[PDB]
Amino acid sequence: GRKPCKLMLQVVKILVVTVQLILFGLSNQLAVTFREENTIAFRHLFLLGYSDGADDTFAAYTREQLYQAIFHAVDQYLALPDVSLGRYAYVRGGGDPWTNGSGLALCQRYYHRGHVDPANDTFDIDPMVVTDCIQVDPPERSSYKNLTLKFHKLVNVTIHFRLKTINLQSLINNEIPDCYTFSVLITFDNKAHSGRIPISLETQAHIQECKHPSVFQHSFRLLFDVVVILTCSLSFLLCARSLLRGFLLQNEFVGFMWERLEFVNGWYILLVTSDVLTISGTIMKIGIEAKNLASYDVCSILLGTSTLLVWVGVIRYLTFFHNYNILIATLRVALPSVMRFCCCAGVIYLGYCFCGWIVLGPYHVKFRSLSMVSECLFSLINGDDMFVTFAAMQAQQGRSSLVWLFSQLYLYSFISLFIYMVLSLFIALITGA
Amino acid sequence: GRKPCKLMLQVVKILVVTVQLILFGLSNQLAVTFREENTIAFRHLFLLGYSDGADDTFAAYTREQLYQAIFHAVDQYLALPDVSLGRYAYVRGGGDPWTNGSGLALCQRYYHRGHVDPANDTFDIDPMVVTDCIQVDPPERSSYKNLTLKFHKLVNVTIHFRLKTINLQSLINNEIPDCYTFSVLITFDNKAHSGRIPISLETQAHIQECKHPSVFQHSFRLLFDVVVILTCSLSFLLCARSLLRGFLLQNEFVGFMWERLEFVNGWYILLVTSDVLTISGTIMKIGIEAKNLASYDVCSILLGTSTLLVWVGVIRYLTFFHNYNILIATLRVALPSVMRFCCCAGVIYLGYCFCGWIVLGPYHVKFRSLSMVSECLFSLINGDDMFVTFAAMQAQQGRSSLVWLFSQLYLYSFISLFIYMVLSLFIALITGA
Amino acid sequence: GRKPCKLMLQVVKILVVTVQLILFGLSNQLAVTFREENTIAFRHLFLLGYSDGADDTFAAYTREQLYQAIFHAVDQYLALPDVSLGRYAYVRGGGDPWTNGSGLALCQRYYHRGHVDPANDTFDIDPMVVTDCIQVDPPERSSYKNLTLKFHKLVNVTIHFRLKTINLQSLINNEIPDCYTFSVLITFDNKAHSGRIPISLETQAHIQECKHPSVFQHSFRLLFDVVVILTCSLSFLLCARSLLRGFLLQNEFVGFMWERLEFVNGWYILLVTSDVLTISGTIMKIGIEAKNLASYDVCSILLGTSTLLVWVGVIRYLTFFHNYNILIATLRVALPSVMRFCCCAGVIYLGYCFCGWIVLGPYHVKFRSLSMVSECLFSLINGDDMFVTFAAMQAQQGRSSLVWLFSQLYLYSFISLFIYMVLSLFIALITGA
Amino acid sequence: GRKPCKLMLQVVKILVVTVQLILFGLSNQLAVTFREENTIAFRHLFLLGYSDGADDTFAAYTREQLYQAIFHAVDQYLALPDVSLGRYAYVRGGGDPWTNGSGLALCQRYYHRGHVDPANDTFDIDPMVVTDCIQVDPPERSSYKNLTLKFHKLVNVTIHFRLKTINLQSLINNEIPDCYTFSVLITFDNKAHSGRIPISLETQAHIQECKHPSVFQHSFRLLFDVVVILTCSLSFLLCARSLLRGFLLQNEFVGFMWERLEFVNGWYILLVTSDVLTISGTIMKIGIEAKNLASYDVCSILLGTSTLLVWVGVIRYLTFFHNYNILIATLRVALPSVMRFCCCAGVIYLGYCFCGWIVLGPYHVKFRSLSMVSECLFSLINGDDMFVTFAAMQAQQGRSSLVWLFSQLYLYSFISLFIYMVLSLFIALITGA
Ligand SMILES: COc1ccccc1N1CCN([C@H]2CCCC[C@@H]2NS(=O)(=O)c2ccccc2)CC1
Ligand SMILES: COc1ccccc1N1CCN([C@H]2CCCC[C@@H]2NS(=O)(=O)c2ccccc2)CC1
Ligand SMILES: COc1ccccc1N1CCN([C@H]2CCCC[C@@H]2NS(=O)(=O)c2ccccc2)CC1
Ligand SMILES: COc1ccccc1N1CCN([C@H]2CCCC[C@@H]2NS(=O)(=O)c2ccccc2)CC1
C-alpha cells in the first residue's frame, strides 16, 4: 500500500537538535559565570577605590592618584595568597612580555622625543613609541616603587600578569573540575592627553585539562552529538535526492516548454542549510568539549541559526492544511510591496541618520556613532526612548539654542513623517485588496 | 404573571465577592509591610557596611572582609536589646540547628577531603560535605571569635537565629495586635569558588496568636465570609440545575437529530468555576484569619481568579442588548484566525528565542534565561526596551565584533519580520470581511 | 447690508485668556522654585547625613542614630544664623505647639500604658496617646539634651519650628520682593514598630506682604484681568441670548411637531462653561495676587480647564469648511461604538486589576495600590514598562515559584487578550463602513 | 543617437557629498572629545568633593562649605603644574576681567545698598550691582584668603581663568597637533537667595594654530572640498537651465490656455537648495579647517540638511519605475487629509499643553516648561514614559489630592481621546478609498 511519509525523521530533528542546544547552552552559561565573577573579584582586588557600576567613569586625575593606583595594584598582586580567597596560583611567566622567571610586568609606554611646551606654542614630537618594562617576581613564600612616569611623554601604562585556578563549579554539573588560567591586563590609558586617564582591567581565560584529576565518582554528550550527525547526514542525503529528482524533471520541462526558473521548493534548501550548519556546529562543539579548540562564538552562532532554520520547518508542515495555507499565502503576497516601500523609507532613513549624526553627534549622547544613530532612530520609530532623547537635548538649551531648535524640528519631523508613511503604505494595501 | 429573573442574585455576587477581596487585600498589605520593613532593619542591623539598593552586588572579596562581616553579625546579635529599637526577643532555640539552650548557630560548611593545588594542576576532592557548627547563647541580661574558615575547602557559611516580636500595627486596623517570630538566615555563599562571596539575608515569619492579649476595647469578617459561602452555594445549585435541564433537552435532541456537541452555554460553566474557587478561597481565608494555616499564595490566587471570572459575567449580561451583541459576535468570529496565525508566529518566535538565548546569553544581561529571552522578545514586539537592548549590545563592540554584527542582524530581522507579519495577518482580516 | 459676524470677539478670547494664563504661569513657577529650593536647603541643614535622592529610603535603625539625628536637628536650628547662608529669622512662636516665647518644639508622642513583652507573649496597651513637649528658645544673640525616648512605647517624634525670610527673586521679575514664613516639621515616624524609623522633613509657606518695602523704582496685571472679565462677561451675555432664542424656537417646534431634545448646539454650552470658569479663576487670581487668599490649586485648575475649553472653539470654527467637516463627522459617528466596546473592555480590565492587585500586591512594587495597578495595566496596554514588570517578577522566582508562574500567565494573557480585542473592534469598524 | 542622461552626475553627488560629511564628522568627533574630557578633568580638579553624575545637584549649603570650595578652587589653580597631569600652561591674562599680569580673577558680585531684615519685615534694596575682584597671579616657578563674602547682599561669586594646552590626539588621525586655550569659569550662583547655592564649571575653547609645529612626517581634504564645489556648481547650472526652459514653456502655455501655477517639478528646486547649502557648508568648513573662523554649528547643520535633501533624490529616481510610482502616488494623495486632521488635533493638543503646564507645572518634573510639556505629550501619544508620568504624579498623592485626581482625569482623557482620534481619522481613509 501507500507507505507513510518519512518526514517524521524531521520531527526527530526538531526535538533532537533542540535538546543538544539546550544542553550546550546550560554548560556554556556556567563557564561564562565563572569567567565573569572572577573578573569582578580581580577588579575589587586590583583597582584602588573601585566600586560596582563605576566601570566607564573610573579614571585618575592627579599624578598621586596614578602612582597610588599602580602601587596598590602591584602590592595586591604581591599579597594575593594572604589576602585573597579563591586559591589562585602564580605562573612565573615565560612569555614575551615577561622574562624567564618573572610574574608581573609593569610597562610604561611613551614617545621617544617629546618636547611639549605650551606658553610658547612650540613642540617637536617623534611618534615612535619606546616601552620601558619593570619585571616583578612573585613572592617566594622590589624595585617597582622607584618608578618615574614622564607624564608629558606618556602614552599608557600597562600591568600584565597571569593567575592559574581550578574551576570547582563542575561538581554541581557532575563534570570533572575544569581548569583555568586568567591573563589579566590593567591599562591606564593616556591616549587623549586630556588630563583624565581612564583605568580598566581586562581578562582572557585559557581553559585546559589539568594534569591529575583524582576526583571521586568522576558517555552521554559524546553519543548525543554523533546521533545529531547521523540524523542531519540522513536529511542531507534525502533532501539532495529530492533536489536531484526535481532538477531532472525540470530539465525535461525545459525542452517541453521550449517562474520557470523556480521549480524547486526552497524548503529543501532551508533544510540542507540547517543540516550543514548543525553538522559544522556539532563538530566544533565536539572539539570545544574535548578542549582541543577554544572558540565559543562561531559554534554557538551556527547552532542557533540551525535551530531557528529547523523551527521554520514546522511552518512548512503547517502549510499543508488549507486554513493555515490561506494566511501563509496572504503573507507571501504582501511581502513584495513591503520591500518596495522599504526601499524608499530606507533612503529617507539613511538621509536622516547622516543628518542626525553630523549635527547632534557632539551634543547628544545617543548620536555618537552611525550605528548608534540608526539604533536610536529605529527605536524611535516604534515609540521607545522618545522622551529621554527630548530631555537629553533639553539639557543643552542654554548653549547653542540654534542647535536645540534644529534638534526639535528634526525629531518632530522624523517621527511624524515616518508614522504617516506606514499608514499610507497600508491604506494602499487595503485598496489593492 | 411572568416572574422576574433571579439573575439579580449574580449582581449581588459581583458586589459581595468584590468587597470581600478588597477587605482581604487591605489586611494582607499591612502584614507584608510589617514583614518587609523588619527585614530591611535586619539587613541594616546585621550586614556590615550595607546600604539600600546594594542587594545583588553585596559581596566580600578578602578574608578579612569575610571575618569582619561574620563577627559584626554575631556581635550585633549579641548587642541587639541595647542598640536595636523595636523590642525583639530571643528564642533560646530548641530546633535542629540549635542545641537545647542556644540562640544563634554559626555553621561553616565545607568538603571532607579537599586538596586544591594549582601551579601543579593536581587535585583530589571528595564531594561529601561536612558541617561544623558553633552555638552561641543569647546574652544573660563567647568562643565564636576563635573560628577558622578553611577558605580552600569552603562551600558556604550560614548564620541562623530567630527573633520574636509583637505586631503593633493592628491597632490602626482595630485588630488585636498580631504576633510574629522571624527566622533569620545570613548566607555567605562560596559555591562558585570565584573569589567573590555573595552575602545575603533571608527571613521567614511564623504568625501565631500569642498568649494573653490584654488590649483595651479589643464579628463582621466572620459573618461576611459565610455570606459569601451562602451566595456562592446558591449559584452552584442554580447553575447545576440549568446544566442538568439543558443536558436532558440535549439528550432528547440526540435521538431527534439521529455544533451538536455544544448545547450548553459556557457562561454557566464559568459561573460554576467561579463559585468553586470563591468557596475554596474563602474557606482558606477563614483558616488564615483563624491562624490555623499559613499559606497566603493559594488563597489570594483563588480569590483573584474568582473575582476576574465573576467580572466576565457582566459581559455575559451585556451580550443581551443587540448593539453590544454585534461587537461581541465580531470578536468571537475574529478569534479563530488569530489563533491560527498565532501558531506560526509562535514557532518562529520559539526559534528566535532559542537562537537568542544560545548566542547572546554569555554577553547580554537580558538573555540569561529562556524565560528572560521570551520576556525580552515579547516586550520588543510591542516596542519596549529596544534601545536599551541595542546599547547593551553596543557596550561589547570592542570584543567579538562578529557577535555584535550577528546581534545587530538578529534584532533588526526579528523586529522587522514580526511587525510585518501582524500587518499581513490583518490585511487578510480586512479582505475576508 | 449683511453685517459681519461678531465671532471675532471669541478670536480675542483665545488670545487674551491664553496670554493671562502664560503670565500667571510664569509668576507661579518662580514661587514654587523659591519654595522647593529652600526646602532642599532645610533638609541639608537639618537632616544628619542626608544626601540628594535619599528621600524615601532615609531612616534610622539604632537608638544612637535617632538620638544623634534629633540632637543634630536641634543644634543646627540653634546655630542657624552663624552657619546658614540665606538670612532666615526666628519667629518666637506664639501658636498652639509653642508657648509664649519659644521657637522650637520637640514633641515625643507615645502610648499611655504600654507593656510590650515578647518571650512571654503577653501585652497590655492603652491606645490613648500622651504627648510630651520640650520647648527650646532661639539663641539670644538648653535642656533638650536630657531627653529620654521610651522606644517601646514610642509612636513618633516631631520637631516644629518656623523661619521668616524675604523673597528676593522678584527683582528679576520687577516685582516688589515677596515675603515668606516657612513652617518646618521634621517627623521620625515609628508607627510600624518594625525597627525602621523613617525620617522626613515637610514645609508649609505662608506668603504675606511685609511691612515697609523701601525698594527703588518699585498697573498692567490688574488691568489685564478686568479685561478678561469684560470679554468673558460679554460672551456669557451673547451665548445666553443665543440659548434663549434657540429655546424659544424649540418651544414653538414642540407644538408644531406635536433628536427632538437636541435643538441647541453644545458649542454655546461649552463657551458658557469656559466663561464661567475663566471669571471664577481670574477673580481667584486677583485675590491671590492681592495676597488676601492663598490657594493656588483651584485657580490654576480653573484657568487651565478654561484655556482647553476655549481652544476647542477653534475646532468649532474649523467645522464650517466642508473638508474639515467631513472628518469631524467621521469622528462623531465613530464615537458611540468606541464607547460601547469600552464598556466590555472596562469590565474585563477591572477584573484583571482586582486580580493583579490581590495576587501581585505583596511581591511586585508596581501593584501596591489599585490606582497603581490601573496605571500599570493602562501603560502596559500601550506598550510601556513591560520588561521592567517582567524583570521585577523574575527577581522573585526563587521564592514562591507558583506565584511567578501565575504572574507569567496573567501578564501574557492580559497583553495578548487586550491587543486582540482592539484589532477585532476595528475590523468591525472597517466592515460597518 | 539618443544620448544617455547626464543624471549620473547626481549619482556622483550622493556619493561625493556623503563622503565629505563622513570625513568631517570623524574629525569633529575627535575635537569634541578633547573638549569634553578636559572639562571633566577640570571639574575633578577644581570642584571640592565632586563626583561623576552630580552636576545638577552639586551645591553648597553652609558658609564654611562655600569658603572651602572657593579656597580649594584657587589652591588647585595655584598647584596645577605639580598635581595635574596633562601639561597645562598659564596665560597671564591681559583681558578685561584680568589686569596686566594676573592669571585668575575671583569676583564677588553683590548689591550696592542692601538691608534685608526679617523679624521686622522691613527692607531697602538698590538693584544696582557692585563687583569686587581679587586678582591672583600664577605661581612663579596671596591675599585671596582674606576674602569676606557678604552673604546677605550676595548675588554670585565667579572664578575666571585660562589654560593653554596642546591637542596631541591628532597624531592618531595623522594631523598636525592642534592647539587649544580653555577659558574656565566657575560660578557659585546665589540668585534665588534660597539658602542653596549651586556650583558649576563651564569652559570655552579657542582653537588656534600654534607657532612652531616641528612634528615628524607632518592635500586630500583641500582637494576634496573643491571637488564638491565643482560638482555642486555644475548641478546648479544644469538645474537652473531646466528651470528657465520649463518657465519659458510655461510662459507660452499662459497665452495658450488664456495646477496651472505648478508647471515646474519641485525636484529641481530641492536639488538647487541642496547645492546652495552644500556650497555654503563646504566654504564654511574650508574656513573652519583653516582656523580662520570657529563656528561648528552652522556648518554641520548646513552639511546635514544638504545630505538629507540629496538622499531624497534617490526617491526621485525611484519614482520612474511604475511599481514604486504607484506607492509614491498613494503617499502623495494621502497627505492632504493628514494635514487637515493635524490642524484639529493640533488645536486640541495646544489646549491640553496649556492646561497641563498651568496645572501640573508646580508638582510634576516633566511639566516645567511649555516645550517640555509638548515633548511629554508627544511621547505619551506614541506610548512612551506613561508609567513614569503616572508614578511621578502618584508620589504627591498625600498633598493636594484634588490635584492628583485632576492629573488622573487629565492623563487618562488625553491618552484615550488621542488614540481614538487616530483610528477615526483612518477609518475615514479606508472609506474614501
Ligand atoms: C529592516 O529595515 C530597516 C533596517 C535597519 C534600518 C532601517 C530600516 N528601515 C527600512 C524599513 N522600514 C522598516 C520600518 C519598521 C519595520 C518595517 C520596515 N522593515 S522592512 O525592511 O521593510 C522588512 C519587512 C519584512 C521583512 C523584513 C524586513 C523602515 C526602516
Ligand atoms: C500569547 O502569545 C505568546 C505568548 C508567549 C510568547 C509568545 C507569544 N506569541 C504568539 C502570538 N503572538 C502574539 C503577538 C502579540 C499579541 C498577539 C499574539 N498573541 S495570541 O497567542 O495569538 C492570543 C490572541 C488572543 C487571545 C489570547 C492570545 C506572537 C507572540
Ligand atoms: C478611558 O478608558 C479607561 C480608563 C481608565 C482605565 C481603563 C480604561 N479602559 C477602557 C477603555 N479602553 C481604552 C483602551 C485604550 C484607549 C481606548 C479606550 N478608552 S475609551 O474609554 O474607550 C475612550 C474613547 C474615546 C474617548 C474617551 C475615552 C480600554 C481601557
Ligand atoms: C507634527 O505634529 C505635531 C508636532 C508638534 C506637536 C504636536 C503635533 N501634533 C499634531 C499632529 N498630530 C500628529 C500625531 C502623531 C503623528 C501624526 C501627526 N503629525 S502631522 O502634523 O499631522 C504630519 C503628517 C505628515 C508629515 C508631517 C507631519 C498630532 C500631534
CATH of the domain at A410: 1.10.287
Beta strand extents in C154-232 (DSSP E only):
154-167, 178-189, 197-205, 212-213
- For residue B108, how far is the Cα from the chain centroid? 30
How close does chain C come to B234, measured CA to CA in Å?
A: 22
Interface contact flag, A362 D32, Cβ < 8 Å: yes
Atom of ligand 1 nearest to the CA of A341: 22
Residues 6+ apart with CB under 8 A from D94: D100, D101
Ligand minimally distant from the alpha carbon of residue D377: 4
Determined by which method?
A: cryo-EM
Is residue B246, in this structure, part of any structural domain at all? yes
Considering only CB atoms, which chain D residues are within 8 Å of A423? 334, 426, 429
How far apart, in whole angstroms, are the C-alpha atoms of residue A155 and residue A147?
A: 16
- The shortest CB-CB distance from A177 to any of B123, B351, B386 is to B123
Q: How far apart are CA D331 and CA A299, in angstroms?
A: 46
Rounded CA-CA distance D327/D321 in Å is 11
Question: Do A210 and B121 make contact, defined as CB atoms within 8 angstroms?
Answer: yes
Which of C230, B429, B198 has its CA nearest to residue A40?
Answer: B198
What single-letter amino acid sits at A86? Answer: G
Helix axes A401-431, A370-381, angle to 10 degrees: 50
* Cα separations in angstroms, A375 against A350, A370, B100, B328: 12, 9, 64, 41
Which H or E element spans position A239? helix A221-257
Q: Where does a domain end: A258, A286, A320? A: A320
Q: Does residue D430 sit at the C interface (CB-CB below 8 Å)?
A: yes
Q: Smallest Cα–Cα separation from A131: which of A103, A112, A159, A104?
A: A112
Whether residue B35 lies inside any domain: the answer is no
CA distance B395 to chain A (A): 10
A271 closest CA partner among A209, A334, A314:
A314
User: How distant, in Å, are the alpha carbons of C74, C161, D57 from that of C201?
Assistant: 13, 11, 18
Q: Give the residue from C64, C193, C376 with the most B CB atoms within 10 Å of its CB, the best one to mutate.
A: C193
Task: Tell which of A280, A300, A320 closes a domain.
Answer: A320
B196: closest chain A residue by CA: A41
B180/B315 same-domain check: no
Q: Is the CB of A352 under 6 A from ligand 1?
A: no
Judge contact between D143 and D134, C-beta under 8 A: yes
Q: Are residues C269 and C359 in the same domain?
A: no
User: Judging by beta carbons within 10 Å of its beta carbon (0-12, 13-18, 19+), is residue C360 exposed, middle or buried?
Assistant: buried
Q: Which residues in chain B have Cβ-Cβ distances shorter than 8 Å to A215?
A: 123-125
Q: Is B198:B157 a contact under the CB 8 Å cutoff? A: no
| Partner residue facing A425 (CB), from D314, D324, D327 | D327
Q: Which ligand is nearest to the CA of D426?
A: 4
Which positions ≥6 away from A213 have C-beta within 8 Å? A176, A177, B123
Into how many domains does chain B fold?
3
Same domain, yes or no, for A187 and A61? yes
What strands lie across the sheet with D122-125, from one edge to the other?
Answer: C212-213, D122-125, D114-117
Cell 459569601 sits on residue: B228
Evaluate whether C211 touches D120 at the Cβ level (below 8 Å): yes
Q: Give yes or no: residues A140 and A259 share one domain.
A: no
Pocket probe for ligand 3: among D405, D407, D415, D416, the residue whose CB has the most ligand atoms within 8 Å is: D416
Q: CA nearest D81: which of D137, D138, D161, D134?
A: D138
Q: Are A287 and A255 in contact (CB under 8 A)?
A: no
Look up cell 519596549; give the residue: B384
Q: Could you tell me if A398 lies within 8 Å of chain D, comparing CB atoms?
A: no
Written in H, E and C, the secondary structure of chain D is CCCCCCCHHHHHHHHHHHHHHHHHHHHHHHHHHHHHHHHHHHHHHHCCCCCCCCCCCCEECEHHHHHHHHHHHHHHHHCHHHHECCCCECCCCCCCCCCCCCCEEEEEEEECCEEEECCCCEEEECCCEEEEEEEECCCCCCCCCCCCCCCCCEEEEEEEEEEEEEECHHHHHCCCCEEEEEEEEEEEECCCCCCCEEEEEEEEECCCCCCEECCCCCCCHHHHHHHHHHHHHHHHHHHHHHHHHHHHHHHHHHHHHCCCCCCCCHHHHHHHHHHHHHHHHHHHHHHHHHCCCCCHHHHHHHHHHHHHHHHCHHHHHHHCCHHHHHHHHHHHHHHHHHHHHHHHHHHHHHHHHHHHHHHHCCCCHHHCCHHHHHHHHHHHHCCCCHHHHHHHHHCCCCCCHHHHHHHHHHHHHHHHHHHHHHHHHHHHHHHCC
> C85–D64: do the CB atoms touch at under 8 Å?
no
| Contact A433/D at CB under 8 A | no
Beta pairing class for B197-205 and B59-60: antiparallel
Chain breaks in chain C (C to N over 2.5 A) after: 141, 218, 258
* Whether residue C98 sits in one domain with residue C237: no
Q: Please name the chains neighbouring D, where neighbouring means 3+ C-beta pairs under 8 angstroms.
A: A, C
User: In terms of CA atoms, which chain B residue is nearest residue C195?
Assistant: B86
How far does residue D14's CA lie from ligand 4's centre (Å)?
29
Alpha carbon of B343 to ligand 2 centroid (Å): 9
- Which atom, in ligand 2's list, is nearest to the CA of B422? 14
The grid coordinates of residue C181 equal 514664613
| Distance (Å, whole) CA D60 – CA D67 | 10
- Pick from D121, D348, D388: CB nearest C210: D121
- Cross-chain Cβ contact C118/B40 below 8 Å: no
Contact between D378 and A412 under an 8 Å Cβ cutoff? The reply is yes
Closest in C121, C152, C196 to B210, CB measured: C121
Phi, psi at residue A120, to the nearest 5°? -125, -20
Closest among B88, B92, B116, B115 to B103, alpha carbons compared: B92
Select from D312, D332, D333, D342 the residue to mutate for testing ligand 4; criterion: most ligand atoms less than 8 Å from CB.
D342
In Å, how far are B315, B402, C104, D304, D396 from A297, measured between CA atoms? 53, 8, 68, 38, 50
CA dihedral C99, C101, C104, C105 (to 10 degrees): -20
Find out whether A373 and A358 touch, Cβ atoms under 8 Å. Answer: no
Q: Which structural domain, as residue segments, surrounds residue A149?
A: 47-205
Question: What is the residue with the minimal CA distance to atom 30 of ligand 2?
Answer: B346
User: Does the residue B211 lie in any domain?
Assistant: no
Q: Please return the burial class of D14, using the count of CB atoms within 10 Å of its CB with bins 0-12, 13-18 and 19+.
A: middle
Asked if A316 and A329 sit in the same domain, the reply is no
What order of strands is seen across the sheet that includes strand C178-189?
C59-60, C197-205, C178-189, C154-167, C104-111, C129-136
Pair D75, D190 in one domain: yes
- Chains touching A by CB (3 or more pairs below 8 Å): B, D
B315 domain residue, yes or no: yes
Both D193 and D274 in one domain: the answer is no
Q: To the nearest 10°, report the CA torsion of C25, C27, C30, C32.
A: -60
C340 and B327 within 8 Å at the Cβ level: the answer is: yes
- Whose C-alpha lies nearest to ligand 2, atom 5? C412
Distances (CA, A) of C159 to A225, C172, C189: 73, 35, 12
Within an 8 Å CB–CB cutoff, is residue B118 touching chain A?
yes
- Written as nine digits, the cell of C157 is 517624634
Q: Does the beta carbon of D412 lie inside 6 Å of ligand 3?
A: yes
D 160-199 residues inside an 8 A Cβ radius of C: 190-197
C-alpha cell at C198: 523613617
CA distance D257 to chain C (A): 29
Nearest CA of chain D to the CA of A357: how many Å? 8
| Cell triple for B250 | 440535549
Domain boundary among B205, B234, B252: B205
Q: Measure the CA–CA gap between B289 and B284, rounded to whole angstroms.
A: 9
A167 & A244 share domain: no
Classify residue C36: in a domain, yes or no. no
Residue D39 lies in a domain: no
Neighbour-count burial for D48-69, b at 16+ CB within 10 Å, e otherwise: bebeeeeeeebbbbbbebbeeb
Confirm whether C380 is domain-assigned. Answer: yes
Q: How far apart are CA C312 and CA C273, in angstroms?
A: 12
Atom 10 of ligand 3, nearest CA residue = C346
Which grid cell sits at A206? 585559557
For ligand 3, atom 8, the nearest C-alpha belongs to C346
Q: Please, which residues bridge with residue B139 across strands?
A: none
A335: contact with B, CB 8 A cutoff = yes
Which protein residues touch ligand 4 with a CB less than 6 Å away?
A 412, 416-417, 419-420; D 338, 342, 345-346, 349, 374, 378, 381
Domain identity same for B130 and B98: yes
Is A176:A153 a contact under the CB 8 Å cutoff?
no
Alpha-carbon distances, residue A188 vs A48, A61, A151, A162, A200 (angstroms): 12, 11, 12, 18, 7
Q: What residue in C sits closest to D419 (Cα-Cα)? A: C382
Task: Give a yes or no: residue D41 inside a domain.
Answer: no
Give me the torsion for CA of C45, C48, C52, C58, rounded to 10°. Answer: -130
The rounded Å distance from CA C416 to ligand 2 centre is 5
Residues A191 and A63 in one domain: yes
Closest CA to D430 of B432, A388, A331, C432: C432
Q: Do B424 and B302 share a structural domain? A: no
Pocket of ligand 2 (CB under 6 A): B 338, 342, 345-346, 349, 374, 378, 381; C 412, 416-417, 419-420
Q: Are B350 and A311 in contact (CB under 8 A)?
A: yes
Sequential DSSP letters for A329-359 = HHHHHHHHHHHHHHHHHHHHHHHHHHHHHHH
Give the amino acid at D335.
L
